[PDB]
């Protein structure tokens, strides 16, 4: 039968270990699970499998653009802030807004600035002007885990455009991840 513990009478100091799926009942109540869709939208793989805006850059010349990639404190991706460590594939969505040219894109977790001077070794997929690509950067991280908060939690992204004439433009960036491994959930964030 039902114990008084499952009826509401408990002790907060007896909750450890963390993660106790204890059932709560009353005479007219029972945990009822109802699913409205064929799958879950709470699973890390599904939720995060959907991109979210990151930032935009306007380029008037080929100069290279390197930006630290970090988890959002803004979109649905904020749900990541509930975790401390991450590891796994990283989907980067880049849009090249230009009239005539090409955009070199590359990703590295390496903090050294110089390693990115010769962009070709790193990757540098090519998005023709007016096209958008989605490259999935692997976990080539020199650190087993990525503190999820760091201003560079995610590796740096490189964008250099091979323009042809006076043409200029702007590069919008969106980020998403493939199968994410989060660990050791930390306390919920505050609001600004």
């Amino acid at each position: 039968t039902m114990s008084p513990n499952e009826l509401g009478l408990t002790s907060a100091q007896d909750d450890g270990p963390l993660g106790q799926e204890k059932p709560n009942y009353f005479l007219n109540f029972r945990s009822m699970n109802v699913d409205i869709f064929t799958v879950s939208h709470t699973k890390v793989d599904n939720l995060f499998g959907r991109a979210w805006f990151f930032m935009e850059h306007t380029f008037t010349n080929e100069g290279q653009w390197r930006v630290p990639l970090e988890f959002p404190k803004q979109g649905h991706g904020s749900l990541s802030l509930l975790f401390a460590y991450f590891t796994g594939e990283l989907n980067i969505h880049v849009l090249f807004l230009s009239e005539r040219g090409f955009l070199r894109v590359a990703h590295t977790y390496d903090t050294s600035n110089d390693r990115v001077n010769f962009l070709s070794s790193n990757g540098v997929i090519t998005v023709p002007a007016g096209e958008q690509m989605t490259l999935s950067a692997p976990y080539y991280s020199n650190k087993p885990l990525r503190t999820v908060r760091d201003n560079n939690s995610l590796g740096y992204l490189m964008c250099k455009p091979f323009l042809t004439g006076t043409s200029t433009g702007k590069i919008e960036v969106y980020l998403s991840l493939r199968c994410p491994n989060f660990f050791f959930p930390l306390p919920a964030p505050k609001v600004t």
């Binding site: 509401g8 009478l9 109802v34 409205i36 505050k190």
Partner: protein
Amino acid sequence: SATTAPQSIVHRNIVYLRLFPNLNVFVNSYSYFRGSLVLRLSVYASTFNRGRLRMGFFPNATTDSTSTLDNAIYTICDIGSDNSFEITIPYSFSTWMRKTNGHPIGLFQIEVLNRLTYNSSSPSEVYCIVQGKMGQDARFFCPTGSVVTFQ
């Protein structure tokens, strides 16, 4: 408090998911949800203090006003060794899923049933903490834009 009379209110307010750190995050991520909500009142008194406190909840209520909880989902708390009391609210809405950041969850009221008793060496008033979490049947559905920015 020892001072508060029976039927006097020790707490009253309209509950929203955003009022909870953990939940407020999902509120800023998903658009809808469903499932029961569990609130746990933890009164920290000494081993000498004794008394009762009834906390009820009118699901989907909006008028923030003290009202008899005889018809509301309530839980009477008798101070003892395990001074943490839970109360479950089963999903209650016209819709199958409900806005994550929409209509209130209901009216939450914790009225005094029996004045907190004490003695020469025990406190005449104690501190209380109210926590909130989702039930084992909790679910969230559509991810929507953000209504706030975290840090």
